[PDB]
Design a protein around this ligand. Sequence first.
Ligand SMILES: [Mg+2]
Ligand SMILES: [Mg+2]
Ligand SMILES: [Mg+2]
Ligand SMILES: [Mg+2]
Ligand SMILES: [Mg+2]
Ligand SMILES: [Mg+2]
Ligand SMILES: [Mg+2]
Ligand SMILES: [Mg+2]
Ligand SMILES: [Mg+2]
Ligand SMILES: [Mg+2]
Ligand SMILES: [Mg+2]
Ligand SMILES: [Mg+2]
Ligand SMILES: [Mg+2]
Ligand SMILES: [Mg+2]
Ligand SMILES: [Mg+2]
Ligand SMILES: [Mg+2]
Ligand SMILES: [Mg+2]
Ligand SMILES: [Mg+2]
Ligand SMILES: [Mg+2]
Ligand SMILES: [Mg+2]
Ligand SMILES: [Mg+2]
Ligand SMILES: [Mg+2]
Ligand SMILES: [Mg+2]
Ligand SMILES: [Mg+2]
Ligand SMILES: [Mg+2]
Ligand SMILES: [Mg+2]
Ligand SMILES: [Mg+2]
Lengths: 129, 80, 32, 156, 82, 205, 123
Amino acid sequence: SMQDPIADMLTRIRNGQAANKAAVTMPSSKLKVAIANVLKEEGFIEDFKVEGDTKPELELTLKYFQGKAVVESIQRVSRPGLRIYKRKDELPKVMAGLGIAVVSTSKGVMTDRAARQAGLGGEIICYVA
Amino acid sequence: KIRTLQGRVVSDKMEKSIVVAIERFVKHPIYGKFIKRTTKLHVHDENNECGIGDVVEIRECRPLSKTKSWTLVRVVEKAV
Amino acid sequence: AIETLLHDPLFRQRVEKNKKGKGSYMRKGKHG
Amino acid sequence: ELQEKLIAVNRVSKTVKGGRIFSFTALTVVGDGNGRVGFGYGKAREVPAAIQKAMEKARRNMINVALNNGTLQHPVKGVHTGSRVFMQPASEGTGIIAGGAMRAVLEVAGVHNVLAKAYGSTNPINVVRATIDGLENMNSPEMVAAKRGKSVEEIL
Amino acid sequence: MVTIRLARHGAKKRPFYQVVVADSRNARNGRFIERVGFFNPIASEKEEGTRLDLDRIAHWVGQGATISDRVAALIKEVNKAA
Amino acid sequence: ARYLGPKLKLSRREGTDLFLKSGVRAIDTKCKIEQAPGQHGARKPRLSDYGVQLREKQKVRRIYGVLERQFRNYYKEAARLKGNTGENLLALLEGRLDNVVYRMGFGATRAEARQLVSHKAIMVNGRVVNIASYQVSPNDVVSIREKAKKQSRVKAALELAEQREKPTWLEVDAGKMEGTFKRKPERSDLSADINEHLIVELYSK
Amino acid sequence: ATVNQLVRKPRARKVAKSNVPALEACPQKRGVCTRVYTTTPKKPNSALRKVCRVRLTNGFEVTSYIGGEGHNLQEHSVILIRGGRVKDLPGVRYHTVRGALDCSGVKDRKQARSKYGVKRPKA
RNA sequence: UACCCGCAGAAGAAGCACCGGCUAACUCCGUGCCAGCAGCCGCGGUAAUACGGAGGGUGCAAGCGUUAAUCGGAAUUACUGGGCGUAAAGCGCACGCAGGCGGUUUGUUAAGUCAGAUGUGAAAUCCCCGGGCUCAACCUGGGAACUGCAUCUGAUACUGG
RNA sequence: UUAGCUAGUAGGUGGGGUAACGGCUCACCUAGGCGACGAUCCCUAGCUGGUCUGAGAGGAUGACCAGCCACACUGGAACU
Ligand SMILES: [Mg+2]
Ligand SMILES: [Mg+2]
Ligand SMILES: [Mg+2]
Ligand SMILES: [Mg+2]
Ligand SMILES: [Mg+2]
Ligand SMILES: [Mg+2]
Ligand SMILES: [Mg+2]
Ligand SMILES: [Mg+2]
Ligand SMILES: [Mg+2]
Ligand SMILES: [Mg+2]
Ligand SMILES: [Mg+2]
Ligand SMILES: [Mg+2]
Ligand SMILES: [Mg+2]
Ligand SMILES: [Mg+2]
Ligand SMILES: [Mg+2]
Ligand SMILES: [Mg+2]
Ligand SMILES: [Mg+2]
Ligand SMILES: [Mg+2]
Ligand SMILES: [Mg+2]
Ligand SMILES: [Mg+2]
Ligand SMILES: [Mg+2]
Ligand SMILES: [Mg+2]
Ligand SMILES: [Mg+2]
Ligand SMILES: [Mg+2]
Ligand SMILES: [Mg+2]
Ligand SMILES: [Mg+2]
Ligand SMILES: [Mg+2]
């Protein structure tokens, strides 16, 4: 069955990147939307568009620079089977600072750097290189 | 402002007494999975108010028996 | 006990390993 | 101005009606002491010839590697066949902490500071390839910025 | 009872003493309640040989603790210095 | 605890001039500096990756006159300290009292300097120091004591030094026979041929 | 492999037994030469390798190789064994120490003397 | 006693292992599957850089080798960090209790989670900056650390109720 | 390749006992209590601060120094 939605989304994104797809649609969720927004902010996707009332579809628009993909790698870190929380000192540096680590904090989802700045840790959703 | 634990009542057969399983959601040392570990406690209760499968709040006290060193403070959700 | 003496592994028919013929091939020489 | 290291020379055989026909493979690598590195694998009936061939091969099909100062830009993993190979940038003065074939490639490339482990196989040919792959994939900060539509300041 | 006393902690022939509040029954270098200073007899020029956390000592005394003769002497010296 | 044997042999083995002799007479005249020692000198085997590193390590150790355990300790210390490891190690080596003396020019050779140190000749901030391994800090004046000031060897050493290239990081007086260790030397002040990095690598396998 | 699985039943460390168990984690042991005899090695080698069956101090009857050119050991000769197994020999897991207890040093030996219990020659 | 000053004279003071590859260091002589070596691969059957001796070298050095034992290398029990079509590895197939995991929205709670504070986490040891023995080891002042536990006050994205 | 174990056993009442709570103990009443989150049984072992190793996470260990425990020819017992 479907157990992780965030993970699924990530996978979809990865596959889109692989297959040189312009856009990647999926069922929406709030967390997912937040993640997408974060990605956009960080500059790994062009745009995201949530669309529908009853059952709304998120639709990301993947980014390609000089032929190849932008989202070079993208892993789920915490996952339902085995969660990962991190205190603000323990927050990771993905690709030695070049990549980002999406982290859910009490003041919302944000990139690792942002979290650090704030002075708070949290659940580490995904790494994006 | 007293240290008090919640838990379900596993059994209430022995008189003026109950046994209360207290669940705790500890992280594993090595693997980092979060396990539900369980702590059965023999708790004293005068009047025998608690039924089985009943959620109940308990505090630590001086020992009332061999195995019994906790006393209940209130009952919650006693539905059957 | 002469027959037993002859039997001992000490006096088993040795055969010298080849260097150029059949068992010639050595994977690694005595020195590099 | 191109330093060149012969990593390994290895004797290989092809059996025929007569007997064994031996031959020698030679795995070399060359680099300029900056980004550019190339490995060559040359085979011949005699060793020197093979080595020469390898060198020639190396000299064409080079590859550039973004080097932040004397070291890598971020920790990188490279794999190829059996060898899978971790290499992590390091502080000035640590030297090339790496094993054998991997070391040689690094040295020519002009990385002076690395901590590098080879897991899996250590088949020199494969390991060097893996290392090269790792180097190749590794992106600089500037490149990343370009990709993402940001300034290097914004990323840090 | 609780006493304030020295606790030999140094090398051979170069003793450095630690002053400590401690139950009298315990061994010299063993268990102690609080380390309230130190004393160094093999101290060079231009360095503090002795140093007592005086307030703590006072508190201990108030509580009802004895003071070793040497410790008392040290205290006196400190006072003089002050 | 010291190498007492032939000095030029070591140099030969290394390849280079290790300055294990006073420098009156050119090293080529005293020995076949190119040809390695022993019966199998003329043969030059292709040296391994480990081997080159080892050789390098030896060279440095030989130069300063330091046995292995001590060297290891020094390396460890360097590692512990902040900044580039090899450089740190080099600095530490330099800092040795005997080495400093040699640099100043009170010993013709490093060995000579060491001997002098041993034989209670070298005061460091007015206190006689006998340990060759003593680390001379910045702004530590280091001098010949009045008893050893008359020795003809010392003046010879000084003369020799005067012919040699002077180090920037010290400041020495020939008349007063006393020198100030002004600062720990930068890598650029020392010899370029020493591949400290190799040494560092070696102590990580 | 699965984290849950691991939790249920964790990972077993491969317990490696000793190859010199008659020592009982001692660097040497004393024993008496129950018998002393030659043995042929396995292929490809050829020799009459000198070995002694040795009743050790701790009860164990082992068989110990005797190194060096020549030896003095008889029956009832007290010797010190040290661990080390001859490869060509089946069943030998120990060397005699030469130069300890009754086992004598090797005669006329001038290199690796210490390994063969030989004192430095005076001249 | 430490320490210092004087006296005489190079005087009283260097060994151990190794040199086939791994592994830094090679030649001659004797023996000839013997004698012996060996950590692994192996060497030795008359030109042995592998045995024994010598000369020569290499590495350590008042120590140097061997043995034992532990971690390392071993991502070779893999949490970090492995695998299972053919190399060892998918229950013969299902149902299914316990257990694990659980789509989406809003509210609430605040158990997990995160933040801050308080108490504690002995001293020593480790690490950082210093000081003291001529240096060092050693001794030592101050810090940091002791990744934890408990409590109190918040945060509420994520998980839980 | 140890799966069942326990009748002062688990709880209650009331006496007695303790410096003190308490099946600590006794009398009566109830029939419980523990256990696959490994009870019971068997083998091994003093525990910790630490030490060694390791990039770490881990692994191994617990001489010396310091904290705690237990023991004092073996098995009991009390007295002060
Ligand atoms: Mg393999
Ligand atoms: Mg010494
Ligand atoms: Mg350093
Ligand atoms: Mg060699
Ligand atoms: Mg030998
Ligand atoms: Mg002959
Ligand atoms: Mg011969
Ligand atoms: Mg032959
Ligand atoms: Mg030989
Ligand atoms: Mg091992
Ligand atoms: Mg391991
Ligand atoms: Mg495997
Ligand atoms: Mg098969
Ligand atoms: Mg199979
Ligand atoms: Mg099947
Ligand atoms: Mg959910
Ligand atoms: Mg909470
Ligand atoms: Mg907190
Ligand atoms: Mg502490
Ligand atoms: Mg000092
Ligand atoms: Mg909820
Ligand atoms: Mg919620
Ligand atoms: Mg009662
Ligand atoms: Mg009563
Ligand atoms: Mg490891
Ligand atoms: Mg006795
Ligand atoms: Mg008794």
